mmCIF file of C-alpha atoms in Angstrom:
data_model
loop_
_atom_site.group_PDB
_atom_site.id
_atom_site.type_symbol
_atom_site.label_atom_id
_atom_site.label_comp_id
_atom_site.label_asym_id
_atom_site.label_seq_id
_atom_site.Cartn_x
_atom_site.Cartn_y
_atom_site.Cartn_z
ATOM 1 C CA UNK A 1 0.000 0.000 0.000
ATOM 2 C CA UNK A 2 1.734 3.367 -0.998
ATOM 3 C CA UNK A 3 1.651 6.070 1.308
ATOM 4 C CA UNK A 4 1.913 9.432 0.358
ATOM 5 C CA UNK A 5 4.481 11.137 2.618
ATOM 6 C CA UNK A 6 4.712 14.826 1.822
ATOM 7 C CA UNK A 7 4.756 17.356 -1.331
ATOM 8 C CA UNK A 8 7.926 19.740 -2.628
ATOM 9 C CA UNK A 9 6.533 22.598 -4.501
ATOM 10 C CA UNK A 10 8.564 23.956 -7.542
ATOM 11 C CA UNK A 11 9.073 27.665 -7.450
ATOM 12 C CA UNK A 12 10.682 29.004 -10.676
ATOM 13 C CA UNK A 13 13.663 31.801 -11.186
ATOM 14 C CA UNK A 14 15.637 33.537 -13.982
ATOM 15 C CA UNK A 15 18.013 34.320 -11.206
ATOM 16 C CA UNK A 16 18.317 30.937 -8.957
ATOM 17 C CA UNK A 17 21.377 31.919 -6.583
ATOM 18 C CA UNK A 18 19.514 35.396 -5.950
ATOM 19 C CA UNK A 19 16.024 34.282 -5.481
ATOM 20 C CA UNK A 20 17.423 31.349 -3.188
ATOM 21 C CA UNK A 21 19.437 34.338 -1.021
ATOM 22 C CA UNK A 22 15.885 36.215 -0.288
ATOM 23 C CA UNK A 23 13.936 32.572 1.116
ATOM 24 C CA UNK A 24 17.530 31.812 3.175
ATOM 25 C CA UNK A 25 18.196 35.501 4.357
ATOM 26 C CA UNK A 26 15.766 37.609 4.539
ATOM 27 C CA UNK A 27 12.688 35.022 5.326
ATOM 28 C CA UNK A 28 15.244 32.542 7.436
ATOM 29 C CA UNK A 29 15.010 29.562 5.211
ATOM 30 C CA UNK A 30 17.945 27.079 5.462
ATOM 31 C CA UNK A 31 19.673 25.784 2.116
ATOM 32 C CA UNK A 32 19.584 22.161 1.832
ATOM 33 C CA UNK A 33 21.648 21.538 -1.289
ATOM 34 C CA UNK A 34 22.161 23.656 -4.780
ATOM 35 C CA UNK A 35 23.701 25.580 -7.555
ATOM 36 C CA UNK A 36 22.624 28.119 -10.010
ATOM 37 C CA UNK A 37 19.820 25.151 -12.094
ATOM 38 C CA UNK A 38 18.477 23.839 -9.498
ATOM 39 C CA UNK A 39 18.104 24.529 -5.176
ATOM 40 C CA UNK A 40 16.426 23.615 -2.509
ATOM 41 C CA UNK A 41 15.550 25.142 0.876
ATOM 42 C CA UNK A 42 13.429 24.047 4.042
ATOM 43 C CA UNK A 43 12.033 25.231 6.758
ATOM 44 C CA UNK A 44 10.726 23.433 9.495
ATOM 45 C CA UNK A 45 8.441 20.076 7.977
ATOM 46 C CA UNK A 46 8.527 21.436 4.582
ATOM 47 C CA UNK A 47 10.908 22.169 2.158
ATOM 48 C CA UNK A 48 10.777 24.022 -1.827
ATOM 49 C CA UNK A 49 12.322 23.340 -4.377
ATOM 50 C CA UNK A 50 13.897 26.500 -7.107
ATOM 51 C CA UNK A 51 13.945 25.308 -10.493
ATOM 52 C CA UNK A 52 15.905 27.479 -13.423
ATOM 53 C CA UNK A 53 13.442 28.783 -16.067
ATOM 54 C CA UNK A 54 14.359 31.073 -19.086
ATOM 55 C CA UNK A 55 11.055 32.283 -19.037
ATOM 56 C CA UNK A 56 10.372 35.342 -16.726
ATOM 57 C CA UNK A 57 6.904 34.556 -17.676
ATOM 58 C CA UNK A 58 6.662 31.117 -16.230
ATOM 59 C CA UNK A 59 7.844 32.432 -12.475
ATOM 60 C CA UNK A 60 5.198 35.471 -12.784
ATOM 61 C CA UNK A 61 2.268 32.696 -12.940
ATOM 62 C CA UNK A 62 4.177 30.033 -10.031
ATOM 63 C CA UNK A 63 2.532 30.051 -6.973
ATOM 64 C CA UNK A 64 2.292 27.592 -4.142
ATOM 65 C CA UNK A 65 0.312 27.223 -0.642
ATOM 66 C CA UNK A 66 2.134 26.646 2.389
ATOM 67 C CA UNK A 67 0.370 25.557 5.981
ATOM 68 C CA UNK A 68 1.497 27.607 8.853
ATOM 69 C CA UNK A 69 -0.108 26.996 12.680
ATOM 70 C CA UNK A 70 0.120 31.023 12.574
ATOM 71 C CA UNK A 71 -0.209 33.387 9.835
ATOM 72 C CA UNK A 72 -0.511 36.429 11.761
ATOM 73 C CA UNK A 73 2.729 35.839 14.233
ATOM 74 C CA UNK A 74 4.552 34.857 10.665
ATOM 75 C CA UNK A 75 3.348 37.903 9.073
ATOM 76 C CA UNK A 76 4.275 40.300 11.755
ATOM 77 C CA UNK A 77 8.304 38.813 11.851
ATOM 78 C CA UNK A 78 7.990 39.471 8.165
ATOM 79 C CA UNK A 79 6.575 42.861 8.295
ATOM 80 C CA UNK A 80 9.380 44.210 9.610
ATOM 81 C CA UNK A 81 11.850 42.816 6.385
ATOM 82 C CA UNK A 82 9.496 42.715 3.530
ATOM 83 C CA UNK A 83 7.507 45.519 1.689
ATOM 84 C CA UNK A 84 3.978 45.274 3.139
ATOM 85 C CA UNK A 85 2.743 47.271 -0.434
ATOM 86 C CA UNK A 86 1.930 44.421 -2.523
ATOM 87 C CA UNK A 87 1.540 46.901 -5.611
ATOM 88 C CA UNK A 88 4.954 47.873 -5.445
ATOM 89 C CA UNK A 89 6.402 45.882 -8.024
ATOM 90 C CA UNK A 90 9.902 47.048 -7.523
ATOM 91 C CA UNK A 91 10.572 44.405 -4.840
ATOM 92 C CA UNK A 92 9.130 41.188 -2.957
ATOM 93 C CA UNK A 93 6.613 42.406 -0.870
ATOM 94 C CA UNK A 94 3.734 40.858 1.462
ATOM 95 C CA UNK A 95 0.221 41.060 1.267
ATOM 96 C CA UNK A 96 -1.803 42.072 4.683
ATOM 97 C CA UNK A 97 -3.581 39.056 6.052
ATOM 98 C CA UNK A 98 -6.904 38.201 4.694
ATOM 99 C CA UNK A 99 -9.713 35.686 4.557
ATOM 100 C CA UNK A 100 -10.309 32.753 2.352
ATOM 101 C CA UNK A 101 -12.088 29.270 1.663
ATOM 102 C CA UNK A 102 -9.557 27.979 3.936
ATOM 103 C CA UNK A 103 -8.722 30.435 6.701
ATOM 104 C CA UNK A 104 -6.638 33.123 7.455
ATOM 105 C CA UNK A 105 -3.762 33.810 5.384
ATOM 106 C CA UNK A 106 -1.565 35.981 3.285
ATOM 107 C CA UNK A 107 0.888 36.108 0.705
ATOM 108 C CA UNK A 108 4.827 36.605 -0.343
ATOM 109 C CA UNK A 109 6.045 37.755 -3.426
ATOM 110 C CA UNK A 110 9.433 36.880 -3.878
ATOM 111 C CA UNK A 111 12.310 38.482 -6.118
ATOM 112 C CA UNK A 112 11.871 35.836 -9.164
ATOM 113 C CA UNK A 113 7.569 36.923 -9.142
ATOM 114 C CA UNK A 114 6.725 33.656 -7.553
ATOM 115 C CA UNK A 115 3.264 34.163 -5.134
ATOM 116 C CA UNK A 116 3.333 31.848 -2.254
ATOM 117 C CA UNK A 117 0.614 31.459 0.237
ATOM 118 C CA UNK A 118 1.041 31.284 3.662
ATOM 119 C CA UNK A 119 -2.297 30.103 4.867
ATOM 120 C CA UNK A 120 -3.680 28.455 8.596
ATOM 121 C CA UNK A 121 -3.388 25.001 8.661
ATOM 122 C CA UNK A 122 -3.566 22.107 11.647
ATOM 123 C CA UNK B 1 6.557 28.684 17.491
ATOM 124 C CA UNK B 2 5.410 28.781 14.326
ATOM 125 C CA UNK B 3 4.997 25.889 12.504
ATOM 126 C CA UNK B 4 5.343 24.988 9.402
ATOM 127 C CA UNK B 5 2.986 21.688 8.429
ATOM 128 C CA UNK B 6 2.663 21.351 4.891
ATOM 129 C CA UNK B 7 3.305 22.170 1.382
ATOM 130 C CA UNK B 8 0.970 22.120 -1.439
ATOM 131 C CA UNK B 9 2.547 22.459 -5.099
ATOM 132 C CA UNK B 10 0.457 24.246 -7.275
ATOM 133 C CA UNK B 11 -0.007 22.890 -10.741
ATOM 134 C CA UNK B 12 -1.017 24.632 -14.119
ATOM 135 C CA UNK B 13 -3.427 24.055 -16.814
ATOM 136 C CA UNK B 14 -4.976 25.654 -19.968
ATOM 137 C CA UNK B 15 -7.911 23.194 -18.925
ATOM 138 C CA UNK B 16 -8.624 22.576 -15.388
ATOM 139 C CA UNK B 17 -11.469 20.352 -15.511
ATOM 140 C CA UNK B 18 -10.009 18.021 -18.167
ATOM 141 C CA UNK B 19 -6.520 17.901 -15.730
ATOM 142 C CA UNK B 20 -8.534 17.722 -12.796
ATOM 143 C CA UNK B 21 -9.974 14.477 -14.336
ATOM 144 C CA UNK B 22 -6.661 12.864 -14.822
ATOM 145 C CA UNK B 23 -5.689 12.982 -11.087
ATOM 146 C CA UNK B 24 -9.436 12.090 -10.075
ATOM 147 C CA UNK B 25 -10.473 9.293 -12.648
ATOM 148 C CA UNK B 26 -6.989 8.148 -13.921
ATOM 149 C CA UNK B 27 -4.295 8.282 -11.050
ATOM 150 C CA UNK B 28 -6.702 7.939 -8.313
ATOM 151 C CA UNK B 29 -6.633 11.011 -6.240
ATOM 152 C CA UNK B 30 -9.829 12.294 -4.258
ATOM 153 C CA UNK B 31 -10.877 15.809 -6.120
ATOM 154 C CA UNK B 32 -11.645 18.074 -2.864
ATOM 155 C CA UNK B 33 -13.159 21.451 -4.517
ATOM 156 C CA UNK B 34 -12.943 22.869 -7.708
ATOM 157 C CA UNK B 35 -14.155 25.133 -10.369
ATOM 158 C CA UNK B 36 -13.211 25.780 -14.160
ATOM 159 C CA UNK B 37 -9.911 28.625 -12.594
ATOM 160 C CA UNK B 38 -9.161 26.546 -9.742
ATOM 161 C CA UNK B 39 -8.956 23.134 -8.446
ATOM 162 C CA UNK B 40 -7.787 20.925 -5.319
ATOM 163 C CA UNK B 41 -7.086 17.067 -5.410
ATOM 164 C CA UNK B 42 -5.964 15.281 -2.136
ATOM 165 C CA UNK B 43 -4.262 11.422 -1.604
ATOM 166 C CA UNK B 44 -3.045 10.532 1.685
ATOM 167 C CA UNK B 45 -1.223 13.213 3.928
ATOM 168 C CA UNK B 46 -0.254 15.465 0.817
ATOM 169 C CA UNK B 47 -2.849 17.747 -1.647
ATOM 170 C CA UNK B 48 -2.109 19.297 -4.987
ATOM 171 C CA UNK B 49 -3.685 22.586 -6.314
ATOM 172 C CA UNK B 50 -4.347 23.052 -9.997
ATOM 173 C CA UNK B 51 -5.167 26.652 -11.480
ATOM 174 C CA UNK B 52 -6.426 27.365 -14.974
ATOM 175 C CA UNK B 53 -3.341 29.482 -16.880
ATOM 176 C CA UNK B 54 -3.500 31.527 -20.237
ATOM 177 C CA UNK B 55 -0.295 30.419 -21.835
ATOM 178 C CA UNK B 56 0.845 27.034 -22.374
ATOM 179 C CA UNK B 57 4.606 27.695 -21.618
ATOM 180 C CA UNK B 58 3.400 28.056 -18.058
ATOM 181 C CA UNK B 59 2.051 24.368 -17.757
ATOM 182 C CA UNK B 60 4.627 23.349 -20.090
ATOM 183 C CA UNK B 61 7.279 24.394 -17.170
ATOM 184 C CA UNK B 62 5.736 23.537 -13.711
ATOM 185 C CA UNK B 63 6.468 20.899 -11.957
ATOM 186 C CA UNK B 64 6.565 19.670 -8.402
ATOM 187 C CA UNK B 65 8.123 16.468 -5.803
ATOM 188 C CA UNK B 66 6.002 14.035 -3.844
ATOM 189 C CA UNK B 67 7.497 11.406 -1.497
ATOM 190 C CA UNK B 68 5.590 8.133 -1.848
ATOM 191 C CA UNK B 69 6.534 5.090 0.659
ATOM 192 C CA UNK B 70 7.781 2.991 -2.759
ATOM 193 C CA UNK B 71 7.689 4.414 -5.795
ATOM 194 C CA UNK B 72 8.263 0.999 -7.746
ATOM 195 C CA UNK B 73 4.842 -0.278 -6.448
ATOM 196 C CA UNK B 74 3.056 3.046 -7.318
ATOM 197 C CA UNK B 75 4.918 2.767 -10.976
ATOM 198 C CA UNK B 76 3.107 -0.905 -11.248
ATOM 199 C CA UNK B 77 -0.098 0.341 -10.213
ATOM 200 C CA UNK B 78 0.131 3.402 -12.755
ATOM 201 C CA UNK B 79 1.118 1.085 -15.756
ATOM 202 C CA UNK B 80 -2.053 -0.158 -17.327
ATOM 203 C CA UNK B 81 -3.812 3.398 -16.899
ATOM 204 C CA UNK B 82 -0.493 5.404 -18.308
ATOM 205 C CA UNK B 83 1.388 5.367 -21.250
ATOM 206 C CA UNK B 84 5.150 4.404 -20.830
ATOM 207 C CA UNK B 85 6.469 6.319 -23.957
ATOM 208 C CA UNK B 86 7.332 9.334 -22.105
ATOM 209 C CA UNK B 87 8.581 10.508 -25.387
ATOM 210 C CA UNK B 88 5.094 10.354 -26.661
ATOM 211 C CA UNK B 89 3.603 13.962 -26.497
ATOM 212 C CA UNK B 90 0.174 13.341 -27.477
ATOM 213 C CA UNK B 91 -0.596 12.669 -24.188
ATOM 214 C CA UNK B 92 0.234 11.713 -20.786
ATOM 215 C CA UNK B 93 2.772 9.882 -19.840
ATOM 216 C CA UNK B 94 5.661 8.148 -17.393
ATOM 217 C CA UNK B 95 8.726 7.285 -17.127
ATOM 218 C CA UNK B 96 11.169 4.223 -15.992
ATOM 219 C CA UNK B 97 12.006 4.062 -12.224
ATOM 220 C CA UNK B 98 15.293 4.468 -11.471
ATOM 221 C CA UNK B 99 17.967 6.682 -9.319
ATOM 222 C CA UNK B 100 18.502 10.099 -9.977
ATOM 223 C CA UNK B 101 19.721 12.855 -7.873
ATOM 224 C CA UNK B 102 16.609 13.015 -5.985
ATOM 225 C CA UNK B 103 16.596 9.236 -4.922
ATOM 226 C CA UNK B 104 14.858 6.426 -7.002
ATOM 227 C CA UNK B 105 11.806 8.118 -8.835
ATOM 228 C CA UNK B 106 10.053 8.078 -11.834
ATOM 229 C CA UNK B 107 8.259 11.083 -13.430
ATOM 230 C CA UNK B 108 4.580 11.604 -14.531
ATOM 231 C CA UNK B 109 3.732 14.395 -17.053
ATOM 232 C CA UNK B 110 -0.166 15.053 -17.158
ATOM 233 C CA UNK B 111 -2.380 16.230 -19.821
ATOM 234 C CA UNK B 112 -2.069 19.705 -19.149
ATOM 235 C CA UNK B 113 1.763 19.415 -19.314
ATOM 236 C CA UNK B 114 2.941 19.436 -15.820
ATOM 237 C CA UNK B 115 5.840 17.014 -14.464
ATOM 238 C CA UNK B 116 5.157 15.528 -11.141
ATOM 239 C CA UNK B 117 8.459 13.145 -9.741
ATOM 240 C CA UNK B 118 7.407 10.377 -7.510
ATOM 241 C CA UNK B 119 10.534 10.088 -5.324
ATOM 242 C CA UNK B 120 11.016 7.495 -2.362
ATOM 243 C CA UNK B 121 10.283 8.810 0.907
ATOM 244 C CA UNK B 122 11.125 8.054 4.999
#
C-alpha cells in the first residue's frame, strides 16, 4: 500500500542563486543543497524546491500554498523585512492578512515573481 | 513557534477540468473542490492545487516532488492506466524508475503538461 508522505513545490527563477538568497536571508530559510539550475531550501516540515526557467513569464504565474499553525505571528516577523505594499512591483513584498475558503492567510512575493501562500493550517 | 505543516505544489493548466480528471479518474486522487480557474485534489497526507493558466509555456514548465513510501509499487499500479512512452507527447505519460539525484523516482507528465516526480520517501 503506498503512502503518500509529503509534497515539494517547484518555485521558478531567472536568477536561482539570488532568489534562493531572499527565502535563506531575509525570510530565514535554510539551504539544503544547490547551484545556479536547481536549489532547494526548508524550513521546518517542509521544504521548496527553485527550479531554473528562461522564461520570466513562467515564475510570474508560479505560486504555491504553504500551511502555517500562525499566519498572523509569521506575518508580523515578516513585516518588519518585507515591503507590506503588494503593488509595489519594484521588490518582494507581502500582502496584509486576509480571509479565504480555507482560513486566514496571506501572501509573499518573492524576487523571481513567484506568489506563495502562507495560509492556517492544523 | 510557528509551525510549518505542509506544502501544497500548485499545478497549471490551460484546462482545469479536463486535468482535474486525470488525477481524479486516472491516477486515483480524491478531487476536494474545484471550479473551471481553480482546483484541489488530495491522496493521503499530501494535496495538490491546480489553477487554470493563459499560456501554455506556463504548464509546459511547472512541476513539483512528492514522497511516496515505494515508488516501484506506485509505478506498477500506474502502468495499465499510463502510457510508458514518455517521449510520446500526445498525451500523458511516465517514465522508468530508477535513481537520480533526488533518490529512485520516476516522473509523470499530465495532460495539461505538468511534471510531477514520484521520489522514495522516509
Amino acid at each position: 500500500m503506498v503512502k503518500f508522505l509529503g509534497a515539494v513545490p517547484v518555485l521558478t527563477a531567472v536568477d536561482v542563486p539570488a532568489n534562493v538568497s531572499f527565502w535563506v536571508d531575509t525570510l530565514g530559510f535554510e539551504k539544503d543543497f544547490g547551484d545556479r539550475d536547481f536549489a532547494g531550501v526548508r524550513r521546518g516540515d517542509i521544504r521548496l524546491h527553485i527550479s531554473r526557467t528562461e522564461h520570466q513569464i513562467v515564475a510570474d504565474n508560479t505560486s504555491a500554498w504553504i500551511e502555517v499553525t500562525d499566519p498572523d505571528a509569521l506575518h508580523e516577523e515578516w513585516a518588519r523585512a518585507v515591503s507590506t505594499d503588494y503593488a509595489d512591483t519594484s521588490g518582494p513584498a507581502m500582502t496584509p492578512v486576509g480571509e479565504s475558503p480555507a482560513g486566514r492567510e496571506f501572501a509573499v512575493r518573492d524576487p523571481a515573481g513567484n506568489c506563495v501562500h502562507f495560509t492556517a493550517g492544523e
